[PDB]
Amino acid sequence: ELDQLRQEAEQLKNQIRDARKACADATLSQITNNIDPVGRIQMRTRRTLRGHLAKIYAMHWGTDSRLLVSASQDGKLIIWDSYTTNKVHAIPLRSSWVMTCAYAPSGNYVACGGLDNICSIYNLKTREGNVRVSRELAGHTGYLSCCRFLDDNQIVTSSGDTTCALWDIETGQQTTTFTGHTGDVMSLSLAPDTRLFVSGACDASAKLWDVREGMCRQTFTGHESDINAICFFPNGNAFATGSDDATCRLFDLRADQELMTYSHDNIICGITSVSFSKSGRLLLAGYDDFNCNVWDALKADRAGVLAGHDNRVSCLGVTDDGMAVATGSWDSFLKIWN
Amino acid sequence: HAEGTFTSDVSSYLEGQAAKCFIAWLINCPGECVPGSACPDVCTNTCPL
Amino acid sequence: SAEDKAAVERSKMIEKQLQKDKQVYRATHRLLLLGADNSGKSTIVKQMRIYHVKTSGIFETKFQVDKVNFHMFDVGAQRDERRKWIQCFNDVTAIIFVVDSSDYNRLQEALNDFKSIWNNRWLRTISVILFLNKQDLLAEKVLAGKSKIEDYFPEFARYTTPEDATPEPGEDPRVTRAKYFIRDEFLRISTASGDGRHYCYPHFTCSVDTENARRIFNDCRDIIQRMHLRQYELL
Amino acid sequence: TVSLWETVQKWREYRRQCQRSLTEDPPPATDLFCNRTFDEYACWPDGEPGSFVNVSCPWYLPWASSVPQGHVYRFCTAEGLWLQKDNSSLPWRDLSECEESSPEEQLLFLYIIYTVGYALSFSALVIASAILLGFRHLHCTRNYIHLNLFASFILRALSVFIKDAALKWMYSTAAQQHQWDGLLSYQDSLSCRLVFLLMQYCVAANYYWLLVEGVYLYTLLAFSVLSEQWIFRLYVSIGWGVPLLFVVPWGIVKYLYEDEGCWTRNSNMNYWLIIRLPILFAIGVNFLIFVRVICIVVSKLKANLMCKTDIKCRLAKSTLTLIPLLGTHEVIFAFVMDEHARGTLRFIKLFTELSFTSFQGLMVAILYCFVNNEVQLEFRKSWERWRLE
Amino acid sequence: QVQLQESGGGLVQPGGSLRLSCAASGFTFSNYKMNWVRQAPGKGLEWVSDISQSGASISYTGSVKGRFTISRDNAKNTLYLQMNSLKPEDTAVYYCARCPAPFTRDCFDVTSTTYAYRGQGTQV
Amino acid sequence: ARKLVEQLKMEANIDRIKVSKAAADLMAYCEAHAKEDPLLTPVPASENPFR
């Protein structure tokens, strides 16, 4: 019989839940009611970037705080110079249904993917100076939701077939495959050491993986809807999740428990993208109500809103040096807020 | 159009009235028909003295 | 500022290429194909492919009718769940929905999928072209008997053929009665929400009717005309 | 339609002839007879002392042919002293022999009405253009054509105001006195003719931008998608440059053949046809486009099982919205030509066209920049953005 | 954590009555749309009924139209399904699925083979 | 039957620490790094790349 295994599973689970509860004695709200509040912070659209024909579905910041890449469902991948709003590259895509974009941490490669189930890697630097498709990765039985360049030769992707995988560009293999999710893995983020990454799926849960090891380390619950996006605290010990239930949450790795939840009654639309600031004090979250809100990472107060978009905000990313934040929305516009 | 027609009508009427006033000034209406002696119709209009 | 001048020239070249691509992108209409496994949408896409990768995931069928260049996307190897990726097709000319009228057992399931597609938040303004495919099998089923569609839907007998019906010559009253019953079953959900923002255009495609492209062209022409009239506040 | 200048020249010739007669004629005054003179009106010779026989009605009079045998009279005394009338300094004179305000109240009424309408339209369209340009969301090709139409309406109103001011300056008291003296007046200037040439061009541009609006709507509804980058330039050229193809020739014809006074009168109707005909063509094409668009709308309403009871109300609202956007109210009296419009019919036509065209700018601004749903949504979004500061 | 449990079921004579109680925890039960999905043996999952978040918009399948009734208890975060006049073809496993997006009418993928927000189910 | 059991067995053996310690570490990190955060403290326009 296997019913005994089924009941002991939840038994060995509830024991985990009560151990987590025992390890929890105080909330962040009580501890944080000492510091001076951040207060109202106003951000203005320093630069707007136009040229995309259709909605913008993803973006990434280059590792130089200057170059920007953005993918839109018109089939065009555009690389901007955020300082001068000059279109450096206008790479056209094979399939127009692109759902994710990435920038290599070297400035030489640019990745993309989407409903075509293929992660395409473009070589920015070439002998003739023309952008070419360096490699195409296949093996995902579902739409590609997110991809992050772990290295110049290694890339980790998360697709809608409840799996995440680690790929090698020079062979297009699947040396490591991360399974365990029970829904479409919507987003993932790498820790700032290229050692562990987290991935939020549609099963209202997040998991911590290990690129070197290959299996999930811990998993986090607490959400009641699909996790639309995920981020990572700069220290590497915490990460913030945004879900369709209009509530953001903070989790800690070593604590292995839910820390505190960001929410408000006025807002009702779900999250689309989250991103921490350089100091880890500001948490910027996108929304379907056409504006993104920045909340203090500790006291959970609406410091301000970046209300400047005419349609749903889909992508949002804080620069590597923290000098600026850029949001791309479905109105085919990118804005640089400071 | 109607703007041109209205302008033409107004200008024609004004030119006719200006000619009538030139004739009236030639007659010197203020000193002409003092004792109701054959008062000209051109003296009824309003224009310089 | 020579490097700045070179960068500006490169940006100008890229912008001109972007305008050239924008003209073509705006000059074509994008359609999304939806339907169950036994809906015949594969046969439809195959016939309109000639009328004009392993994993795949998405497909394409560029057919041209009177120089309009419709793009027709059929979803391939994707998981059963479709709540998330359907947001990509929130700005398309129309959504083509194909239903197997003969299959009574899964008819209700097709009804719920059509209802969910109609009531989706991100497809509120997207019109739907309805293709009640496999009409010949539906025709032969009722004449052959031993079907009893009334058990699945306890409303057939309390229903009469609408006066709007225009049955083809030399066809049985029972077959057109069933056809219009199914069409009105779909139209009941169609005319229950959306006000005047998106509509449903039902058609009766038999198996291989070559006029499917013409029907799609006419429906897209109606949709664009309605949109333009709405922009001018006439409609 | 004899101008003041022509009458002045004829009177100058008459005065020259009178001066010649004052000296060349033989003197019939034997001893204290009547004395020849010139009272600035007619030549008065030396008649019989104790008689009233005098000369006929002089020429140079603007009415001219009226009782040609009629004679203005003035009696000589016993000594021919030009008997005084009522103890004045002017001798007795009878003028009821050559004596030759209905068309003023109507003109003043029309002027007041269309000036008020044009001022209201000017203000409303300036506000509408500011609203359309301010919001970056409303930056489509349709809104560009709307902005061009608004600018054309504003130019038409400004040209009308300047034309009225120039008409006031043309026939002022100072100008009349200057023309009496004989020297060149404002009527001989060049800006005076350019004002009315500008007015004609502005009117033609307004009509052809209404035509462009109708053509763009018809191409959107009927044809396929064309290159907006290449079609907007063509539409702008059609709207702004085509009137130059029959306004400049009209100005050239006015300069060459029919100069008259500041190109304000249309004594020759054939030269007026140069401006009247293309505008009629635009009006007819726009009426055809209006009929086609209304047919399309009524076809849309009578389909998709939507038609239950609101076919007439919605169609009425759509027609009343479409009427001011195009030049359709003017087709009622457009085909009643200027030559055949006389009496009360001419006044009715002038009143209808002037008032409706004056208020059409305000109606267009209201219906396409204030009640428009996109503009209201933009204002609501801007207010919401300002609310949270 | 999203947890759904079902109570009831079993084996009864045809034409009888059965009561199904669904217990939901881990989310605000008063801000969601709950659906009933049944799967007959040797057959795929079939949608049965849906209940709106306000308890007004209620629909059923034509197979059990006018015979199956539903009840929702937002205060207790529980759902009760009452069935009568059991038919020989009504034997199936019933799951009290939940629509993914809160505060909305539509919900996709309720009848998925591997739907995340679905309970274990109770055999009837 | 076996994969989930083994994964949950691995999950059971954990070395989780007190929440207060991790929270205090978080506060220490934000307090230490808030000095050079351009978004938190508006950098003057002299050295701001986006004028």
Chain E residue with minimal CA distance to C112?
A: E47
User: Which chain A residues contact residue C17 at CB under 8 A?
Assistant: 90
Residue D308 and residue A334: Cα distance in Å, rounded?
46
Chain A residue with minimal CA distance to D138?
A: A310
Nearest to A297 by CA among A324, A276, A320, A315: A276
Question: Could C153 and E62 be called an inter-chain contact, meaning their C-beta atoms sit closer than 8 Å?
Answer: yes
Say whether the F–E interface has 3 or more Cβ pairs within 8 Å.
Answer: no
Residues in contact with C31: Cβ distance below 8 Å, sequence separation at least 6, in sequence order: C70, C71, C72, C73, C92, C93, C94, C95, C96, C129, C216, C220
- Classified as helix, coil or strand, C54 is coil
- Measure A254 CA to nearest chain F CA, in Å: 5
Distance between terminal CA atoms of chain A? 62
**Residue D350, Cα to own-chain centre: how many angstroms?**
10
Does residue D111 contact residue D103 with C-beta atoms inside 8 Å?
no
Using CA atoms in the order C134, C137, C143, C147, what is the torsion angle rounded to 10 degrees? -90
Cα three-residue angle A13-A14-A18, rounded to 5 degrees: 120
Chain C residue with minimal CA distance to D290?
A: C234
Q: Angle D173-181/B2-27 helices, nearest 10 degrees?
A: 60
Tokens of C83: 């709540």
Resolution in A: 3.0
- Measure D206 CA to nearest chain C CA, in Å: 20
Neighbours of C146 (CB within 10 A): 5
Residues in contact with A326: Cβ distance below 8 Å, sequence separation at least 6, in sequence order: A59, A61, A68, A82, A316, A317, A319, A334, A335, A336, A337
Compute the half-sphere exposure of residue C130: CA atoms within 13 Å on the CB side of its CA.
Answer: 26
Nearest to A34 by CA among A299, A262, A238: A299
Question: Could A310 and D388 be called an inter-chain contact, meaning their C-beta atoms sit closer than 8 Å?
Answer: no
User: Which chain D residues contact residue B5 at CB under 8 A?
Assistant: 266, 338, 350
DSSP string covering C61-75, please?
Answer: --B-SSS--EEEEEB
Nearest to E102 by CA among A263, F39, A220: A263
Residue A98 and residue A71: Cα distance in Å, rounded?
7
Q: How many domains does chain D have?
A: 2
Residue A287 and residue A274: Cα distance in Å, rounded?
9
Task: Give the CA radius of gyration of chain F.
Answer: 21
CA distances from D253 to C69, D240, D260, E49 (A): 52, 21, 12, 83
Tokens of F49: 């790349």
Within this chain, do residues D87 and D134 fall inside the same structural domain, yes or no? no
According to DSSP, residue C58 is labeled B
Q: Are strands E18-25 and E34-39 parallel, antiparallel or unpaired?
A: unpaired
Question: Could F39 and A325 be called an inter-chain contact, meaning their C-beta atoms sit closer than 8 Å?
Answer: yes
Q: Quick one: three-class SS letters along chain A? A: CCHHHHHHHHHHHHHHHHHHHHHCCCCHHHHHCCCCCCCCCCCCEEEEECCCCCCEEEEEECCCCCEEEEEECCCEEEEEECCCCEEEEEEECCCCCEEEEEECCCCCEEEEEECCCCEEEEECCCCCCCCEEEEEECCCCCCEEEEEECCCCEEEEEECCCEEEEEECCCCEEEEEEECCCCCEEEEEECCCCCEEEEEECCCCEEEEECCCCCCCCEECCCCCCEEEECCCCCCCEEEEEECCCCEEEEECCCCEEEEEECCCCCCCCEEEEEECCCCCEEEEEECCCCCEEEECCCCCEEEECCCCCCCEEEEEECCCCCCEEEEECCCCEEEEC
Tokens of A299: 């006291």
Does residue C39 contact residue C98 with C-beta atoms inside 8 Å?
yes
Residue A255 and residue A338: Cα distance in Å, rounded?
34
- Classified as helix, coil or strand, E22 is strand
Chains that touch C (3 or more CB pairs under 8 A): A, D, E
Q: Quick one: three-class SS letters along chain F? A: CCHHHHHHHHHHCCCCCCHHHHHHHHHHHHHHHHHHCCCCCCCCCCCCCCC
- Which residues lie across from A89 on neighbouring strands? A79
Say whether the F–B interface has 3 or more Cβ pairs within 8 Å.
Answer: no
Q: At E91, which amino acid appears?
A: T
Residue C8 and residue C108: Cα distance in Å, rounded?
59
Q: Provide the H-helix boundaries in chain E.
A: none
Question: Could D297 and C235 be called an inter-chain contact, meaning their C-beta atoms sit closer than 8 Å?
Answer: yes
Stretch 171-200 of chain D: residues touching chain B, C-beta under 8 Å? 171, 173, 176-177, 179-180, 196, 199-200
Going from the N-terminus, what domains does chain E have, and what CATH number goes with each? 3-124 (2.60.40.10)
Stretch 136-195 of chain D: residues touching chain A, C-beta under 8 Å? 137
**What letters, b where the CB count within 10 A reaches 16 and e where it falls short, cover F9-40?**
eebeeeebeebbebbebbbebbeebbeebbbb
Question: Could B11 and D41 be called an inter-chain contact, meaning their C-beta atoms sit closer than 8 Å?
Answer: no
Q: At D194, which amino acid appears?
A: L
Stretch 312-371 of chain D: residues touching chain C, C-beta under 8 Å? 314, 318, 321-322, 367, 371
Nearest to D231 by CA among C16, C234, C23, C29: C23
According to DSSP, residue C168 is labeled P
**What letters, b where the CB count within 10 A reaches 16 and e where it falls short, cover A216-226?**
bbbbbbbbbbb
Picking from D293, D305, D372, the nearest residue to C191 by CB comes out as: D305
Residue A161 and residue A181: Cα distance in Å, rounded?
9
**Residue C128, Cα to own-chain centre: how many angstroms?**
5
Residue D383 and residue D132: Cα distance in Å, rounded?
17
For D346, phi then psi, to 5°, come to -65, -40
Chains that touch E (3 or more CB pairs under 8 A): A, C
Residue E25 and residue E5: Cα distance in Å, rounded?
9
According to DSSP, residue E7 is labeled E
Picking from D142, D224, D321, the nearest residue to C234 by CB comes out as: D321
Cα three-residue angle D317-C118-C178, rounded to 5 degrees: 95
Nearest to D221 by CA among D283, D281, D295, D286: D295
Does residue B4 contact residue D200 with C-beta atoms inside 8 Å?
yes
Residue D289 and residue D287: Cα distance in Å, rounded?
5
**Which H helix or E strand runs over E95?**
strand E93-98
- Classified as helix, coil or strand, C224 is helix
- Which residues lie across from C133 on neighbouring strands? C100
Chain C residue with minimal CA distance to A226?
A: C84
Residues in contact with A233: Cβ distance below 8 Å, sequence separation at least 6, in sequence order: A239, A240, A276, A280, A297, F26
Burial class (CB in 10 A: 0-12, 13-18, 19+), D343: exposed
Does residue A152 contact residue A172 with C-beta atoms inside 8 Å?
no
Residue in the structure block whose two tokens are 């996108």: A286
Residue C216 and residue C41: Cα distance in Å, rounded?
14
Question: Could C53 and A138 be called an inter-chain contact, meaning their C-beta atoms sit closer than 8 Å?
Answer: yes
Within this chain, do residues D299 and D354 fall inside the same structural domain, yes or no? yes
Residue in the structure block whose two tokens are 């799926």: A201
User: Which chain D residues contact residue A307 at CB under 8 A?
Assistant: 384-385, 388
Tokens of A163: 């799996």
Neighbours of D230 (CB within 10 A): 9
Sign of CA dihedral C118, C120, C121, C125: negative
Question: Could C81 and E115 be called an inter-chain contact, meaning their C-beta atoms sit closer than 8 Å?
Answer: yes
D387 and A CB contact within 8 Å? no
Nearest to D374 by CA among D100, D204, D199, D137: D137
Determination approach: cryo-EM
Compute the half-sphere exposure of residue A64: CA atoms within 13 Å on the CB side of its CA.
Answer: 13
Say whether the E–B interface has 3 or more Cβ pairs within 8 Å.
Answer: no
Residue D166 and residue D168: Cα distance in Å, rounded?
5
Provide the residue range defining the domain that includes A289: 2-337
Does residue A260 contact residue A250 with C-beta atoms inside 8 Å?
yes
Nearest to A79 by CA among A54, A46, A112: A112
Say whether the C–A interface has 3 or more Cβ pairs within 8 Å.
Answer: yes
Chain A residue with minimal CA distance to E28?
A: A224
User: Which chain A residues contact residue C7 at CB under 8 A?
Assistant: 81, 84, 86, 88
Residue A251 and residue A189: Cα distance in Å, rounded?
14
Residue A26 and residue F23: Cα distance in Å, rounded?
9
Nearest to C56 by CA among C70, C73, C32: C73
Q: Quick one: three-class SS letters along chain D? A: CCCHHHHHHHHHHHHHHHHHHHHHCCCCCCCCCCCCEECCCCEECCCCCCCCCCCECCCCCCCCCCCCCCECECCCCCCCCCCECCCCCCECCECCCCCCCHHHHHHHHHHHHHHHHHHHHHHHHHHHHHHHHHCCCCCCHHHHHHHHHHHHHHHHHHHHHHHHHHHHHHCCHHHHHHHHHCCCCHHHCCHHHHHHHHHHHHHHHHHHHHHHHHHHHHHHHCCCCCCHHHHHHHHHHHHHHCCHHHHHHHHHHHHHCCCCCCCCCCCCHHHHHHHHHHHHHHHHHHHHHHHHHHHHHHHHHCCCCCCCCCHHHHHHHHHHHHHHHCCCCCHHHHCCCCCCCCCHHHHHHHHHHHHHHHHHHHHHHHHHHHCCHHHHHHHHHHHHHHHHC
Question: Could D305 and C187 be called an inter-chain contact, meaning their C-beta atoms sit closer than 8 Å?
Answer: yes
A19 and D CB contact within 8 Å? no
Question: Could C109 and E112 be called an inter-chain contact, meaning their C-beta atoms sit closer than 8 Å?
Answer: no
Does residue B31 contact residue D88 with C-beta atoms inside 8 Å?
yes
Does residue D203 contact residue B1 with C-beta atoms inside 8 Å?
yes
E112 and A CB contact within 8 Å? no
Chain D residue with minimal CA distance to C196?
A: D306
Does residue A33 contact residue A69 with C-beta atoms inside 8 Å?
no
Residue A167 and residue A138: Cα distance in Å, rounded?
10
- Measure C78 CA to nearest chain A CA, in Å: 5
Residues in contact with A259: Cβ distance below 8 Å, sequence separation at least 6, in sequence order: A28, A238, A249, A250, A251, A252, F19, F22, F23
- Measure A305 CA to nearest chain D CA, in Å: 8
Nearest to C21 by CA among A91, D235, A133, A115: A91
Sign of CA dihedral D15, D19, D20, D22: positive
Q: Provide the H-helix boundaries in chain C.
A: 2-26, 41-51, 107-119, 135-144, 173-190, 212-231
User: Which chain C residues contact residue A55 at CB under 8 A?
Assistant: 90-91
Burial class (CB in 10 A: 0-12, 13-18, 19+), B46: exposed
- Which residues lie across from D38 on neighbouring strands? D43
Residue A336 and residue A334: Cα distance in Å, rounded?
7
- Which residues lie across from A136 on neighbouring strands? A120
Residue A155 and residue A60: Cα distance in Å, rounded?
15
C150 and E CB contact within 8 Å? no
Picking from F10, F15, F18, the nearest residue to A25 by CB comes out as: F18
Residue A244 and residue A240: Cα distance in Å, rounded?
14
Nearest to A240 by CA among A277, A266, A265: A277
CA distances from E32 to A243, D256, E51, E113 (A): 15, 84, 9, 21
**Which H helix or E strand runs over C96?**
strand C94-100
CB pairs under 8 A between A and F: 138
**Which H helix or E strand runs over C34?**
strand C29-35
- Measure A118 CA to nearest chain D CA, in Å: 33
Burial class (CB in 10 A: 0-12, 13-18, 19+), D171: buried
Nearest to E95 by CA among E76, E113, E69, E73: E113
Residues in contact with C168: Cβ distance below 8 Å, sequence separation at least 6, in sequence order: none
Within this chain, do residues D207 and D341 fall inside the same structural domain, yes or no? yes
Does residue D147 contact residue D212 with C-beta atoms inside 8 Å?
no
In CATH, what number is assigned to the domain containing residue D135? 1.20.1070.10
Tokens of A176: 């490591």
According to DSSP, residue C156 is labeled S
Nearest to A293 by CA among A311, A278, A275: A275
Residues in contact with D285: Cβ distance below 8 Å, sequence separation at least 6, in sequence order: D211, D214, D215
Tokens of E47: 């949608």
A48 backbone φψ class: left, alpha, beta (φ>0; ψ -120 to 50): beta
Provide the residue range defining the domain that includes D11: 4-94
Question: Could C108 and E62 be called an inter-chain contact, meaning their C-beta atoms sit closer than 8 Å?
Answer: yes
Nearest to C129 by CA among C234, C235, C44: C44
Question: Could A322 and F38 be called an inter-chain contact, meaning their C-beta atoms sit closer than 8 Å?
Answer: yes
Sign of CA dihedral E10, E14, E19, E21: positive
Tokens of D308: 């239950």
Question: Could A117 and C55 be called an inter-chain contact, meaning their C-beta atoms sit closer than 8 Å?
Answer: yes
Residue D155 and residue E96: Cα distance in Å, rounded?
69
Residues in contact with D377: Cβ distance below 8 Å, sequence separation at least 6, in sequence order: none
Q: Are strands A154-159 and A185-190 parallel, antiparallel or unpaired?
A: unpaired
Picking from D85, D176, D272, the nearest residue to B21 by CB comes out as: D176
- Which residues lie across from A155 on neighbouring strands? A149, A167
Q: How many domains does chain A have?
A: 1
Picking from A89, A139, A226, the nearest residue to C55 by CB comes out as: A139
Does residue C94 contact residue C31 with C-beta atoms inside 8 Å?
yes
Q: Are strands A219-220 and A248-252 parallel, antiparallel or unpaired?
A: unpaired
Going from the N-terminus, what domains does chain C have, and what CATH number goes with each? 29-231 (3.40.50.300)
In CATH, what number is assigned to the domain containing residue A313? 2.130.10.10
